[PDB]
């Protein structure tokens, strides 16, 4: 019933998938072998996990990557038996920070196996609902292979919803200087196929881990643990029997008012480090006010310049509806938040009575109540402006264009990608005026 | 993109590659027989990138040594790690061009290309996945330069899908006053720019002058120059020899570093400067080494990066680095000298970390930067070629092989066009 499949393309995608699946199996009482300890007899988690005859619940996910390092690190890691060998895919040739290699030269000889794995996974899924995609914009594989897979899946299924949790590159954790090319190209290619995508700015998350978690250096592990917490908070309503159930179709209906504007901005609160011997629990109104400052979102942008096309709230923890509505009413009094006249009111209520668990050993601290604020605002226009400004500075001298040229594609593709991003920015400023 | 194969040519190239592999085995805990004898598992994490697993957990270099003069064979078995290289990789000639590019590229080249191609195919289909090719050779030496250029051409027409790194040795008048040096150097750099992806210009002029001015070596022999080149070429290869998030493969190196196909020569930088006879140097702090990269003496190119402008730069740190302090220091260095960094390539300054430090010291850092500043190196090679060419002298040896001067003219024209490309990219701005 409403089964979903999560796809993890690239190193970033597979690592975030490992982290989020670890958190999921922790939360739903799923021990690493896959069996239910005195819990086989909520059925909401059956959408994400497939139960076999033996009783183990293998996740309905696939791990694909073009280098064999992280894949067999997962294979040799703590979860040998959690994932069957078929949803693990390797490759002797990597895109090597090249969208063109991961889209034309190297992608084509693996997408066939990828489609075979997806079909095999969906065979046991009666009520197919949608596709979850995890990848990285900066990475060559996570851009090219993701775009090619998105095109192939649109060709095959089509009307089925497709969700992207894509890593937005940041200079602090950057790996290639050619990342703006790959990011712009992949978001241009997947724009008409990604029904809704969640942009996670690694600079914002880096700063969150530096400050909120009081870490001298947010390594890849802490960043992944935090982003897995964010993704779990977002998708709990789909994986739990919430009162106001929201699914991928409802995600498109609510957080995506315009088909070309499908980048909701997420903001989950609170974030308290494991130390200090006390979390200093914040009230419902306190956490509600804590999800609106420009230092808590998933993308480094100022919401004041942005306009709220649609905003949704998802409380997940020890919360009561009365206090939730009181906090919403108090927030509505703020003039700092404004809704487009076309939208009736940018607010929604999502309540999950189940307490939010925290992954053991993580720097995060257990909190009784929590909430993630999902809003679609034109604040992301600032991030997109930074990205295409980098693209324009980068393309003014045809730097590194020959690497893309050698893999078939030419400067023309750069031309329509740049003009498509330009049209996207005029779409932003068009919907930004009432 | 999993295994690297090393290609060795020329007496200079043979010696530097042999003792480089000596150093690599020493810092990977590999005994002179081939068995692992280290302590940390990081050494064996990606040991297969250079070595090939043999019987009894032995590790053998994937290095193919070629040289017409058999003296290098006795020289390479004379030192340590002489027997680790398999004899089949010791395919050597008999004649010896002796500072003549054409003699070592036409006459005896055909007699060796077949065997070397056969053996390199042997490990190519004996390897799981070929990263690419790396070459250590001398541009001035006729035998080494000719054989290396022929290998480059044959492999490029045979393996166009694989990267081709070259650790070329630029001849210098101070180390050797051979008259025919500019001609072979120009022809070899033409063949390089036609069919290479990464090239580290290991010029001996910089080596000699920094040995004289810093290491106080009045007469630096081959040993000291080989010491510095082995240090820098191990420092650059730390990216490929240990796990890391930056510059995992040769293709990643090319993607991150070189923006233009005809602009791929590299400036090898590494700090500090340690001599063979000195080992009790103090532990230099991170700021000292970060501001040590700007110095021309610490640069292993006979250059001055102040003259040019940095396009892209890669830095890897080895030691007990304070990683946050490393990032803050590199950001401050980039901000303080933004004039030399191209503003039209955002975030072109990258840094990397390596837990294992080179043996002998603890504090070290390499600075592999791509800058147009080698434009003055090409000026010096151009002036050498013109001063030795405007009288149209010494061409009779080359014309005796049947080739005319038209190749010289076209090579000079392409090199001048490359210099013009350097100037145009340097003067470009947003
Ligand atoms: N940095 C170094 N430069 C060297 C070394 N040996 C020679 N050279 C320099 O390279 C140039 C000589 O070129 P080669 O030694 O490679 C002559 P080649 O090997 O091609 O033929 P044969 O030695 O006759 O077999 C000259 O400028 C030398 O000063 C060395 O061990 N290190
Ligand atoms: N948030 C987050 N971002 C990551 C993670 N790993 C990589 N990234 C981002 O991904 C970018 C590079 O992409 P890769 O991780 O190399 O993934 P890829 O596209 O498959 O490229 P290859 O792994 O080399 O094949 C980096 O600049 C990082 O910003 C991660 O674990 N978490």
Numbering used by the authors:
A (entry chain A): 1 to 41, 46 to 438
B (entry chain B): 1 to 44, 47 to 360, 369 to 440
Can you list sentences taken from the study reporting this PDB entry?
In this work, we use single particle cryo-EM to analyze the structures of tubulin heterodimer in the GDP- and GMPCPP-bound solution states without any other cofactors or depolymerizing reagents at resolutions ranging from 3.5 Å to 3.9 Å, revealing the authentic effect of nucleotide on tubulin heterodimer. Comparatively, only one major conformation has been found from the GMPCPP-tubulin dataset and a 3D reconstruction is obtained at 3.5 Å resolution. The conformation of GDP-1 state, as the major population of GDP-tubulin, shows a high similarity with that of GMPCPP state, with displacements of most Cα atoms <1 Å. Our cryo-EM strcutures show that both GDP- and GMPCPP-tubulin heterodimer have a curvature of ~12° in solution, meaning that the nucleotide does not cause dramatic intra-dimer curvature changes. Therefore, GTP analogs are able to stabilize the nucleotide binding domain and such a local structural stabilization propagates through the β-tubulin and allosterically induces the GTP-tubulin into a more homogeneous conformation. GTP binding, therefore, stabilizes the GTP pocket and the surrounding regions rather than leading to significant structural differences, thereby reducing structural flexibility and increasing homogeneity. On the other hand, the relatively rigid conformation of GMPCPP-tubulin is more conducive to the establishment of stable lateral interactions. However, a particularly interesting observation is that significant variations in tangential bending occur around the inter-dimer interface of the GDP tubulin tetramer, while such variations are absent in the GMPCPP-tubulin tetramer.
Microtubules (MTs) are important components of the cytoskeleton networks in eukaryotic cells, responsible for cell shape determination, intracellular transport, cytoplasmic organization and cell division. A pf is formed by head-to-tail stacking of αβ-tubulin heterodimers. The GTP bound to α-tubulin is buried in the α-, β-tubulin intra-dimer interface and is non-exchangeable and non-hydrolysable, whereas the nucleotide bound to β-tubulin is exposed to solvent and exchangeable. A tubulin heterodimer with GTP-bound to β-tubulin is termed as GTP-tubulin, while that with GDP bound to β-tubulin is termed as GDP-tubulin.
